[PDB]
Ligand code: SF4
């Protein structure tokens with residue numbers, strides 16, 4: 342499974358959903374998650390993220406390990422997103438800020 346981590350929060354470009362063959366991205370107010378049972382690890386979305394927030398599960402940085410289980414839980418409650426849309430409005434002010442998890446909205 343591929344995992345979305347911290348830098349997506351408050352950027353949410355959605356470029357990643359274009360390339361997904363199985364549509365396994367689920368949408369929250371300011372973050373996207375990948376559903377781990379649905380992902381086929383084709384790895385096509387990781388190059389398409391401008392925030393470089395997507396990682397193969399087995400390459401999630403040590404300090405972002407929490408995001409693996411967060412993707413799994415929030416995927417069960419958020420709605421499927423299958424079309425790109427515009428980035429959040431201030432997305433590049435926040436691209437690259439660290440510690441954005443304290444800003445996640447359910
Ligand atoms: S690795 Fe492939 S199947 Fe998984 S979210 Fe990315 S594009 Fe979709």
Ligand code: F3S
Pocket residue numbers: 345348349350352353354355356357358372373389390391392393394395
């Ligand atoms: S910022 Fe987030 S919405 Fe997709 S393009 Fe990157 S994982």
